Design a protein around this ligand. Sequence first.
Ligand code: PLP
Ligand code: PLP
Lengths: 433, 433
Amino acid sequence: THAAIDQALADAYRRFTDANPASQRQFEAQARYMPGANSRSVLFYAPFPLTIARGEGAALWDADGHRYADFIAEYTAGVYGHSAPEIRDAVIEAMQGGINLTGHNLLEGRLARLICERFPQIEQLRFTNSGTEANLMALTAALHFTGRRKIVVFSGGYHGGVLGFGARPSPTTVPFDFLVLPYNDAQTARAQIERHGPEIAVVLVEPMQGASGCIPGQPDFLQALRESATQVGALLVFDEVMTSRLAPHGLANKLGIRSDLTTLGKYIGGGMSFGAFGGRADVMALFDPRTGPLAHSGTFNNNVMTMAAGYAGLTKLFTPEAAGALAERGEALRARLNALCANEGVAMQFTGIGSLMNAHFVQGDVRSSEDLAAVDGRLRQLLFFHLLNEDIYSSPRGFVVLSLPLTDADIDRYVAAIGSFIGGHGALLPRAN
Amino acid sequence: THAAIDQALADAYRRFTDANPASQRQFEAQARYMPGANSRSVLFYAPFPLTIARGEGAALWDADGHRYADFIAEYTAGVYGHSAPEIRDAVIEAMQGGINLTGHNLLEGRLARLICERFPQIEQLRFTNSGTEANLMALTAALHFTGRRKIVVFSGGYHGGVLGFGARPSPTTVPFDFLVLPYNDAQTARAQIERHGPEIAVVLVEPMQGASGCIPGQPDFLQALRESATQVGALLVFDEVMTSRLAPHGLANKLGIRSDLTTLGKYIGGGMSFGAFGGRADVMALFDPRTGPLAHSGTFNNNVMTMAAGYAGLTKLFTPEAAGALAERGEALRARLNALCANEGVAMQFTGIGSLMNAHFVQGDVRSSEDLAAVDGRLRQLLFFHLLNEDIYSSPRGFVVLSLPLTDADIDRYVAAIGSFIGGHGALLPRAN
Ligand SMILES: *Cc1c(COP(=O)(O)O)cnc(C)c1O
Ligand SMILES: *Cc1c(COP(=O)(O)O)cnc(C)c1O
């Protein structure tokens, strides 16, 4: 199928290029001032990325005027859609009270309380400006609290712009003392955490890996991390920047597993810049300016616009009930997609939990990024371009994200588009056994 | 004297407490959910910080209704004041077009171009969500570009929440291989950079240290850094997160010293969450997704609200011309204050450049944080509380920051308040000689 796939992809590039001349012009101009016209690597794809001009609800428009149903929703940050009035009105009201207030304010405590109550494993928290900052601070807290240096993470793990892992840390990863272990391998985790126990400050893990392909952590593996971390005296940190959305009180609570710290981000700030870290009060005490040894400084951490937007979103829109309902809608979609793939006999599946899923061109159980390392990326590209042709805006990597305004008809369009993808590319796709 | 200062401080605490019961109530309530009720360490001060309820122009109101002239302006981020309609209208218009757009957009390129034009040592840039992230990325870029690991920084250096230095890296500082050298010591800088030449990836420095107390970098020292970095093959990185506002095209341009990379933050995002790193196109090429080996990820980096607010602020309000004019007003103020202190014979002075200055209770030249090691912190507190009594909201650390809405009358009131401070605390303040 090698040559045929190359040809199909060349055809797709041509069709995309011809359909999007304003986006191509914009790309060429913008490449003068930013490398590859780009400020967030995931937003770039070949031959050039679409410029997005406008959004409303779960609709996006590109520079050439195409309207799409949005199935990516700012990589899970955009759970409210692009134009929620509750969010916009909260931000406008905050701005009318004054911004850059340079002190403790009347909004930060409301959002802090809400988060501690909704995610009770967070006894106290502090706000950051990103998920990346939240994870850096959580790691810093654990190193100091334990007096140890080694940090256990998992291959495929993504914790932010300077905290990413393959078998080894990514080229942009901060040089902490990382021990990188295989995801969903409880035996190796127990053995290695025991071997290095007295040196391990922290075990940092996503309860479902996001960036690596929506790969659920198996309960026996996640429990092994909790058991081993407690055994050796390390802190367990759950990175729930993505997974906090997956159940009314997040995925760790759904699983009944308690981490010492938890990090949050993306949608929790109402669509605005946001992160948070929190957990045990005795660990968070390190940052109490009255008595603790650690400073945690930043400029925009408690900004009134983020505080207002986050509080409005979590109280009026993405409530605990709404999180559960969106999860149910996502489970139904993933089941339909997997049934379709199986019925058609193709080696294609969708992995994930609830409102988050990812297309993969492999058969069998997907338990780690290793199971996906051989996937033909040209097929992911063909899928992406096919979806654009079917008026659906997805991610190049095949990550599908539900948001609140997405209609049942929109979801039907996605399933139909996968059907037409399989129907039209049947000669190119790997066959199931 | 020592006993009398303790007494005066106890009195100030009591008066502050009695006058601010709503702020005290708010602090106690919020301390349940955030350590010390706090999310940004600099905002905490004893006995408890004021809650800020409202801002308009260069005025702030606390929870108990006290109105202050604002002389801190979000630690330089708030150069536009608290309610600039140009900023608010830009943000509103951006929100109306849709947020969380999940792609390259129509606003990021405009702001990138504007910044590159304003600071021509920046050939290309990428946006981040904070100054801390910008510095992390600049360092990461330099390590990869050079294939070296050692990073030269300076005592008292502040580069963000996980990049702070006293004589040694602060407890929260990421464990890069830092070599910490004395600020404003040209001879030591040349010797140590040359001695460790082959190991040094980067020399990272503020052209005027901000957090350590508005300490100008001397021409001989900064030139020694440029020369030494070039000699050994290291990159020079200027952290202009604060200093970019100090002249029409930033401090480094005024001094005529070209760094290989420059980091920016605070006011450049129009008061919204923001940072940027940029410089030589060949270094920034590491991040071009078409060809470069480095990813730079981050959810909110190119968000339309920041892109809109930044562009509106820089084009309509804080233009290069406005930066020059505000710097002139600041120079005039600093000279007035220094003349007053000298005339009164007190060991008190204000250090800095242009629109940024800092009170210090020390006599003689301030060249590094080491010169401030024996200062009595209780005197800074007495000043802070005195200024509150005189309807002036300042920083506990004595950092004074001009913003655009401040009137000449507001500035006169600051000078008068320092006059009344010296007049009323004569017996308590150290003498010049
Ligand atoms: C997006 C994400 C992060 C990083 O958050 P940013 O705000 O983009 O820095 C960290 N962890 C996970 C699991 C994420 O999905
Ligand atoms: C404020 C500041 C930073 C950090 O920026 P944040 O947005 O608070 O992370 C870095 N460098 C200097 C010189 C600063 O003043």
